[PDB]
Amino acid sequence: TCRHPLTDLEANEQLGRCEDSVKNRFDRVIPFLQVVAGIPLGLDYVTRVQELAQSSLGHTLPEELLKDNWISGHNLKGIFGYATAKALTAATEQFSASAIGFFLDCGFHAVDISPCADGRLKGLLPYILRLPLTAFTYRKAYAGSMFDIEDDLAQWEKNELRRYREGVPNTADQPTRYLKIAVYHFSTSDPTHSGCAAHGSNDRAALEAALTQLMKFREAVENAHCCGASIDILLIGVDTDTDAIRVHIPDSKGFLNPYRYVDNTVTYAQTLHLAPDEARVIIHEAILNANRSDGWAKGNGVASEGMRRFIGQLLINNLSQIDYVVNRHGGRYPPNDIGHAERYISVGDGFDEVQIRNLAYYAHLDTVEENAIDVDVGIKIFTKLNLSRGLPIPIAIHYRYDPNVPGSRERTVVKARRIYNAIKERFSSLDEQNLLQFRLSVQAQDIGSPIEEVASA
Amino acid sequence: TCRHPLTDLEANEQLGRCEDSVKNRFDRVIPFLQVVAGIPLGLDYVTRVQELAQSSLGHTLPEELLKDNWISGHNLKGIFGYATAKALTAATEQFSASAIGFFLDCGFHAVDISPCADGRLKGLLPYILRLPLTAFTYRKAYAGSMFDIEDDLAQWEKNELRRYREGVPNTADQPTRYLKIAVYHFSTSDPTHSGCAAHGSNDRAALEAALTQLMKFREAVENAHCCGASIDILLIGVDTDTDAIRVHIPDSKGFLNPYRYVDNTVTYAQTLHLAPDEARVIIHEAILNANRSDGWAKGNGVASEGMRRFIGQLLINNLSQIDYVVNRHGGRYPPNDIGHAERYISVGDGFDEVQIRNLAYYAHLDTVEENAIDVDVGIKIFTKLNLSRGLPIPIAIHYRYDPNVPGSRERTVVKARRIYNAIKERFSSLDEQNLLQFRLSVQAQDIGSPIEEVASA
Ligand SMILES: [Zn+2]
Ligand SMILES: [Zn+2]
């Protein structure tokens, strides 16, 4: 078990430290609750619980959570909800140009990544791809990578208008394109149970669904606008057991083949014992041989220089993540980490500060009526994850708003409260048992904006 | 307080030991639960509860019963259900030719006893009558001794066919008959409250109901078959306070008089100070004087030699039980033992291994729809017995199947699950509060067959 020459050691250590700290903050709540349940409800109950909470979780608890526990029993569910919300707040607060130039040199003025809403793909940008979130990098996760065409088209139009009017990334005459990346996931160890649940854990079904959505988006962009407007499409598959990516190389015209791809597992295997420059040569030629391969991978021409450079950089970055997983877990995630191990249900736009693998179940929705199935899937997952142990389900309803648009924050807060009430009236049996805990938050759309808590009522 | 010369001392000691052990196994659960309720739900709750259970009940508990008790509170109801099921299993496991010859010498090839479903009559065979359960001795208990004519006729036909084809008890030409015994019960101390609840605690009502059912069965056998096919009928009353039987002596033609009977209390009183052979002479003549008495006991002729010998043996056997009660409780059962003191509700065919007085409430039924009133009576009894103390009601659904018939075991298991679900949907308020605990079991119809637990779902 040696180290790859291209591994980013200090970045790996930093990422591991952040992951460990956040997961520990979320996980230490349960032992504290178990200790609390053994404290008699005497006259010293409140003081003892408060000092124990200060010693364990680093914060105290509101007296309303403990004031009437002597007559109403231990308020373990309320303490759990409060502690989970505090852990999420602490994680976000603790988290809180070169990428644009690199994208421009590769021939793109904007990169749009649409991975699956699976929790195992949450850390796709900071861990698997090592791509920072910039003003021109977007991450819109959907269930089964089934991203919506209309909003992507609107984003494309907005970016093109910005290029035409101000040329913020670059002037409109530059021959750069809009890059849309679709990410599917699969499990090598358990293909039939640990795959994409949106497609019945069928690897090829997820692959073809993502490819079809990419093709539909490209054709919609072509149809909606004239003068030969077009976009570039990229397809990436992630093995959730080893966090290794296979990138489907487009041909000269940009079409993607489900069989023409570069797999980073064999690349890591065959570049382990070489030297940095030689490994870079290896991946540079390997992209070419994969793109020029025949048979089922028959492709017309070869991909552009920018495409190949971008894919090579992606593979080099993913090598560090493969090495990170090998170091931390001996080459494969533990059996508990292979499946669902989420700590809370994220509803709305999600958090850009806690992009950690298998931390939360994300349900991209603006209305419960439109995407109820995501909420039901999350509740079903947490029924086994949490309700089996008797713990309540924590739900963070987070939304982003644009401060430039007048009245946007109030509308966003109203939307958050509406979502909270809709999730309340559904699963009303779980509500009556206090098995659902909520926290509502809003944030400005700018990167690094503070997160503001809002009252549930 | 001296001992009757005909008392079976070692048999009495053995029976008392078994009764004490079984009742202690069932009764020691509650103090253990009360001790458990005082254990704080700390980190040592599971270990302490398990070691206490091992020390007290002789067995441990599944972790699922205690794993989430810290957040859901003490699972006293679940532990109660599990411990009661384990006690029943232990009692059955601990329990697990001459009689046929004696029956044949008395002129019967099969004996069928149909006592009331009252719990105080549960130990009628091993204690009150000292009659072992053989391949030709049957015990079908019904509420109010209201045994069903059709199944008795079917059993008679099966036995007669076996005699004709193989002659297993004896050849068909032998002048033996099928003996049907009906047992009613009454209370001397509290006639109006501790009598047969199926007849409003009216002694004469129970007597005439049992006599009418016996007459109906005899006439049905006579009508259904020609060549003068007939059966012998016997009527027995049991005083639940002293476990003493009065046997109604049939006349020469087999008819029974509600007033012509031999009472074993006066027999025990008048045979206490004599010697064995003299006491046997006394009961032999006493049968004759009772059968030859006039007035309201006017009967045509005298009973046969086999009938009188059988009745004399029954009285001699019941003398030992009278002596047993006198020894253990000073001549009468304690006031708590006079009424209802059952530990669980037996539904189905009952257990032949725990035939102990006042141990369980038995509800002979194959469908809740047909005999719902028995279930309601049992639930009403246990509402005062158990629900007053806050304990749940334990219910053992036990059924017997014939392994010779293909597919019988699966059908029996399906029937048990159907009965369990039907009892669940009724009394749904008790179900939601976890006040009903169930255990489902099946057993082969052969005597001594193992009891197999089945899953509730
Ligand atoms: Zn998925
Ligand atoms: Zn009765």
Swiss-Prot record, chains A, B:
Record's keyword annotation contains rRNA processing: no
Organism superkingdom: Bacteria
Record-listed Zn(2+) binding positions: 116, 185, 196
One Pfam family cited in the UniProt record for this chain: CsoSCA_C
Positions of the UniProt region annotated as N-terminal domain: 1-96
Reported biotechnological use: Expression of 10 genes for alpha-carboxysome (Cb) proteins (cbbL-cbbS-csoS2-csoS3-csoS4A-csoS4B-csoS1C-csoS1A-csoS1B-csoS1D) in E.coli generates compartments that resemble Cb, contain RuBisCO and have its catalytic activity, showing it is possible to make artificial, functional Cb using these 10 genes. Cargo proteins can be targeted to these organelles. Artificial Cb assembly in E.coli requires csoS2-csoS4A-csoS4B-csoS1C-csoS1A-csoS1B-csoS1D (but not the gene for carbonic anhydrase, csoS3).
pH dependence: Optimum pH is 8.0-8.5 for CO(2) hydration, and pH 6.0 for hydrogencarbonate dehydration.
Localization in the cell: Carboxysome
Region (C-terminal domain): 341-457
Region (Catalytic domain): 97-340
GO CC, alphabetical: carboxysome
Keywords in alphabetical order: Bacterial microcompartment, Carbon dioxide fixation, Carboxysome, Lyase, Metal-binding, Zinc
Identification of the protein by name: Carboxysome shell carbonic anhydrase
Origin organism lineage: Bacteria, Pseudomonadati, Pseudomonadota, Gammaproteobacteria, Chromatiales
